[PDB]
């Protein structure tokens, strides 16, 4: 029941470039975007915002993933040769799936 948006980030630059806070076992239990690297893929996408909470990466829930593991999954999603994009399911609010 959260209000969510599926944002596709194409790999238009050599970096993804998002700073994320939080993760499991913290008071921000899913990663929240706190800033965006100018000139990176997330910036070029335009649809990712500071304050966006990442519910899923390519359909995979981040619930229960501690910060370092969530960061690892997102890094792998950006590096993969499977596809030239990442789909982030995001929400502006504090309701989780």
């Amino acid at each position: 029941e959260p209000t969510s948006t599926l944002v596709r980030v194409r790999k238009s630059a050599a970096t993804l470039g998002i700073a994320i806070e939080g993760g499991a076992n913290t008071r921000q239990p899913l990663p929240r975007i706190v800033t965006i690297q100018r000139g990176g893929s997330a910036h070029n996408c335009g649809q990712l915002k500071v304050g966006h909470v990442i519910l899923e990466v390519n359909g995979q829930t981040l619930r229960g993933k501690e910060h370092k593991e969530a960061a690892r999954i997102i890094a792998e999603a950006f590096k993969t040769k499977e596809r030239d994009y990442i789909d982030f399911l995001v929400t502006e609010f504090n309701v989780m799936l």
């Binding site: 993804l16 470039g17 998002i18 939080g22 913290t26 008071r27 921000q28 370092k68 960061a71 950006f78």
Partner: peptide, 7 residues
């Protein structure tokens, strides 16, 4: 709350 960059 931890914070880090994913480049």
């Amino acid at each position: 709350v931890p914070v880090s960059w994913v480049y």
